[PDB]
Amino acid sequence: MKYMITSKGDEKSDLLRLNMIAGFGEYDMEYDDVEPEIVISIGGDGTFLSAFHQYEERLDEIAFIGIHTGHLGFYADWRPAEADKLVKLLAKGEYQKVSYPLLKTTVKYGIGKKEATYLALNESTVKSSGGPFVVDVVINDIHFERFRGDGLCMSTPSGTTAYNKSLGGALMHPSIEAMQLTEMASINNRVYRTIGSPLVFPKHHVVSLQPVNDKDFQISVDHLSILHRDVQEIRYEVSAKKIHFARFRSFPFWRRVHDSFIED
Amino acid sequence: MKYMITSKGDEKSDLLRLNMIAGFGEYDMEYDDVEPEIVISIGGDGTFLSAFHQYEERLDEIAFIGIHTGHLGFYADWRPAEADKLVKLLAKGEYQKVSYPLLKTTVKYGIGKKEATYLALNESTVKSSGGPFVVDVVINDIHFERFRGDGLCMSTPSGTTAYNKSLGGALMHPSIEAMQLTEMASINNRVYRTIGSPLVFPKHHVVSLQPVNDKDFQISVDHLSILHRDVQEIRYEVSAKKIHFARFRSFPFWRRVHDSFIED
Amino acid sequence: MKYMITSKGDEKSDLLRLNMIAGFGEYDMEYDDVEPEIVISIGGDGTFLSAFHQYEERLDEIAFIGIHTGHLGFYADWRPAEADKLVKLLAKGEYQKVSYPLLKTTVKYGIGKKEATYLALNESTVKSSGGPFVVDVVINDIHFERFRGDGLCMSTPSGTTAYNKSLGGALMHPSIEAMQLTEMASINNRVYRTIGSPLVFPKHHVVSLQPVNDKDFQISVDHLSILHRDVQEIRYEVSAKKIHFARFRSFPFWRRVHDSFIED
Amino acid sequence: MKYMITSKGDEKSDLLRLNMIAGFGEYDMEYDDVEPEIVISIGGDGTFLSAFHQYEERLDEIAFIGIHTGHLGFYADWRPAEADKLVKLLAKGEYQKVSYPLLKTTVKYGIGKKEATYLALNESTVKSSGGPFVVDVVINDIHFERFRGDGLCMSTPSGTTAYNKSLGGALMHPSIEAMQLTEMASINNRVYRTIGSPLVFPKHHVVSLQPVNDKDFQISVDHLSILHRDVQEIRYEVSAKKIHFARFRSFPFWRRVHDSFIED
Numbered sequence A, B, C, D: 001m002k003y004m005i006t007s008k009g010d011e012k013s014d015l016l017r018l019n020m021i022a023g024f025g026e027y028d029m030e031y032d033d034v035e036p037e038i039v040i041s042i043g044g045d046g047t048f049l050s051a052f053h054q055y056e057e058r059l060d061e062i063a064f065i066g067i068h069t070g071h072l073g074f075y076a077d078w079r080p081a082e083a084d085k086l087v088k089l090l091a092k093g094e095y096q097k098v099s100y101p102l103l104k105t106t107v108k109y110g111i112g113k114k115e116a117t118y119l120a121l122n123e124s125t126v127k128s129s130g131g132p133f134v135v136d137v138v139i140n141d142i143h144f145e146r147f148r149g150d151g152l153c154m155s156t157p158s159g160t161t162a163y164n165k166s167l168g169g170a171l172m173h174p175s176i177e178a179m180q181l182t183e184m185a186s187i188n189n190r191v192y193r194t195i196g197s198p199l200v201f202p203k204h205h206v207v208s209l210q211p212v213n214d215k216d217f218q219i220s221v222d223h224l225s226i227l228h229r230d231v232q233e234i235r236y237e238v239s240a241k242k243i244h245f246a247r248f249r250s251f252p253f254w255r256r257v258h259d260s261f262i263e264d
């Protein structure tokens, strides 16, 4: 079917891309980067995240595949030595699709500057634009805590092995439709109090961050960081949208975790 | 309907129990501790856990209610001052039922000593019977890590605010059908390696602990600790069974967490 | 002797300052903010830190005193209700001096842009100027680790109850001449490895951070954050300089910690 | 001079011991395990700790050396391949001595059962003898916190890379005369509160644990675990005694840490 290939842009990834395009030319495979049905990412997880964001508006029409030309990337299923096998298997259509949950972030502004919405495959984080970070954390309209510290991170299940992990979060199997909120260096004393623990939320729960004094925030979505001014609310919820992977063999999540953090 | 009341056994809980029995006598409420349909626990969370284990074989026929005579217990919905209101509301049948997931622990032995199975509302933990604790951790038959340290804790969602929390685990909303594995003081050096992070598993995943040298273990299920000798395997999975609570008003989990850890 | 008083600048602190100046006028106390021998800070710990930095070049000639007009500040020994008692005790010279260690930070530049040195009472932190933070950590010329993550924090003993604490550091009695290095969200996987644990260094050990790719860093010293470009090295060591407090009664550090974090 | 050699007791360590004894016989070296002046440990850190405790009453007359026949032990300076070089260097007296601090634990009993004192090279820990662990923590007679949880660990500087590290403690250079207290799974909620952070104490500070209800405790000193009944007090302080190592070359502590936890 229609496919496209993104490359990290080093010599190794560019050459692999050109060789895969040549292999696909031996099948009924049209290169089409406007409306692909298969998106192959050649690089690392950053390359994969960029491919995801390039096609975030057609996620229900696309199956993603990642090839890692460096160390095993987490969203990668293939080493470069297997590209020819992948071309063949993709050509014949011999693959199941697996879906991972995504995170929706809504940023609301004052002075009628509307809403912006973002989709995350790894996480969305929030920090101050300089000066202390203080937000009220509201869970399904329940005032839960006032957070003072460096920032907050809201992770998808597949993101839990990324920034979330470094912040002390739990690793969550991606079949669980959830998001996980972790703290970045909260202050805790007789006067300031947060929960400390990571929090795991199901689908349909809404976590709202509400400014207390300063209204300017640096908001990251995967590796894109943007300054938002005059923020009234940041709202997190598990997205109704999902990312779909083409799978050709068993590579269970927990084996992926083992291979990335324990030994490989 | 049929009900019974357990008491922590101090003067305050015993007297409240007797007064509630008197109130129930003004309605079509039969006291029956063999086959109750409502089980009221008066005490703390330990009292509640004991009531759960007293009726673990009739969990699908019973709705539980907890009254806390000391500090707000986590499984408690009522203060003692509200007992009369509770009697009335229970008598009229004005209540919805909510269910929390449970944890199944299976202990397999050698020399054909069969299997023992246990159900946990908070968690199941494992430690050595003395001497170093070393187990292989096998996830759905995938060898994931060799754990060396003080022990491991596998928590239900409602247990995540208990021992799990003290071990660095995430707090998980109990609508999520999952179990969470946390480490107790793992050794990590150039030679010994564990994941460190808490792990959250969905229903149908099986986590098996397999002895490496010593085969004797202290296994806790809620607050019951038992020595198991000649263990071949400890297996954890989310149970098919659930605990049911009678609910008469809104007391959302996240508000319960706020009230217990942030301020109340 | 010569004294001056700094104020947070709210009505309460300004009025207390004016009343203390009036009280001091009844003694042989000259107000002198060029060469004070006693520096009184009225406000919070931020006010105290600012007073310290205002006189960092005369630290061996000055004894500091802090009054907290809000919640108990850590560098505060007095509540506002005790100001008159403090005026009297200071006037008569009835006080011992206690010293806390300080942290020296040296920033070296390329293209012969020399060195800048800074003194910290709480801590010095380093983050990237945007983009990933990666430094080699060199301890007494021994390459110890390559750190990749959000940043690093080097704390004095009295700073260990501040940012250091939120980052998981140990609280250290200030009689110990040491500095403590904590991590901010390090990445750890099969490929990237850091020590994880806080590190405590004695006097005369030098910890050098050396850029790997990007050479621009945001360096904080207490609450002053500065962008440094074209950095070749950041060097941390326990300073030869000390801060001196005037003490009029026993307020042991561990009681101060209890009162600030446990109960008061 | 007088020396002795302890062995882990496997074939490799026993044979190395016999070969070193043969080498020492070519010098003015008397084997004497009653009053040695050099104690060589061949094995791992457990073997070294046992050698330390075998001669804890002559610590000021002995210099210790460790050979690791397995993975690099932390108290080991030599690989087995270097034994012959070590024999030679020891024979000629070409070595400096370095000292590490030690931990004194005093256990006081009721019903006039006196005091027991213990010396630790790694740490002393305390847990309940079964049933909940609850102690008041008193620092220099100041009531600091009531600890409820699994236990407490008090570490020497060289012990900070051992159990202390797994409990989240700081790694401390052994030139610092200090002890470090870490928590094992403390309960923290609206009702129960501990400091959480590791605490680092200088020489001459005394940390006293005082029972609240149960008076029976399991107390570990290095790898020796003993049940103490009817305890009135456990007291920790940095010992006046030190352990002395024979050093023949530079192996800095921080390089030792790097080699054990980062890469080697």
Ligand SMILES: CCNC(=O)NC[C@H]1O[C@@H](n2c(C#CCN(C)C[C@H]3O[C@@H](n4cnc5c(N)ncnc54)[C@H](O)[C@@H]3O)nc3c(N)ncnc32)[C@H](O)[C@@H]1O
Pocket: A044, A045, A046, A049, A072, A073, A074, A075, A122, A123, A158, A159, A160, A161, A162, A163, A164, A166, A222, A223, C132, C133, C148, C149, C150, C184, C185, C186, C187, C189
């Ligand atoms: C230390 C700076 N970051 C990196 O070096 N990331 C590159 C590494 O991260 C792995 N990586 C990525 C990525 C990716 C592409 N990133 C450039 C963006 C992502 O950087 C994460 N992030 C940011 N601050 C972090 C911090 N202080 N600590 C840890 N992470 C941090 C955050 O999740 C963001 O989205 N995604 C996954 C995943 N889902 N599971 C496991 N590993 C994964 C990938 O293979 C490479 O090993």
Ligand SMILES: CCNC(=O)NC[C@H]1O[C@@H](n2c(C#CCN(C)C[C@H]3O[C@@H](n4cnc5c(N)ncnc54)[C@H](O)[C@@H]3O)nc3c(N)ncnc32)[C@H](O)[C@@H]1O
Pocket: B044, B045, B046, B049, B072, B073, B074, B075, B122, B123, B158, B159, B160, B161, B162, B163, B164, B166, B222, B223, D132, D133, D148, D149, D150, D184, D185, D186, D187, D189
């Ligand atoms: C420190 C010793 N334990 C206690 O003082 N527990 C009594 C406290 O625990 C609260 N509690 C209980 C209980 C209950 C009844 N327990 C006697 C048994 C339970 O003790 C837990 N546990 C054991 N080791 C622990 C440790 N080192 N650190 C933290 N916990 C530890 C473990 O989950 C076990 O099942 N269940 C919940 C819950 N699901 N969510 C929130 N709080 C809860 C309850 O209100 C009281 O505040």
Ligand SMILES: CCNC(=O)NC[C@H]1O[C@@H](n2c(C#CCN(C)C[C@H]3O[C@@H](n4cnc5c(N)ncnc54)[C@H](O)[C@@H]3O)nc3c(N)ncnc32)[C@H](O)[C@@H]1O
Pocket: A132, A133, A148, A149, A150, A184, A185, A186, A187, A189, C044, C045, C046, C049, C072, C073, C074, C075, C122, C123, C158, C159, C160, C161, C162, C163, C164, C166, C222, C223
């Ligand atoms: C959360 C933002 N910071 C604050 O709200 N600080 C204000 C609080 O901090 C207390 N405070 C101060 C201060 C002070 C004055 N600061 C404006 C500057 C100091 O903010 C520290 N810092 C920065 N990022 C932090 C983070 N993410 N988490 C924790 N701290 C963080 C850092 O050490 C810096 O120097 N010094 C001490 C001390 N030595 N021991 C105990 N408490 C102390 C003081 O009473 C007030 O309770």
Ligand SMILES: CCNC(=O)NC[C@H]1O[C@@H](n2c(C#CCN(C)C[C@H]3O[C@@H](n4cnc5c(N)ncnc54)[C@H](O)[C@@H]3O)nc3c(N)ncnc32)[C@H](O)[C@@H]1O
Pocket: B132, B133, B148, B149, B150, B184, B185, B186, B187, B189, D044, D045, D046, D049, D072, D073, D074, D075, D122, D123, D158, D159, D160, D161, D162, D163, D164, D166, D222, D223
């Ligand atoms: C996990 C069980 N313990 C072990 O496997 N210890 C054997 C390991 O420990 C290294 N080891 C030893 C030892 C030694 C000899 N031990 C049998 C006794 C010591 O076991 C420590 N301990 C107990 N519970 C622990 C836990 N849950 N987590 C981490 N440690 C734990 C505790 O400090 C005790 O004294 N001393 C040092 C040192 N000062 N610095 C660095 N590594 C060191 C040594 O090379 C081997 O790699």
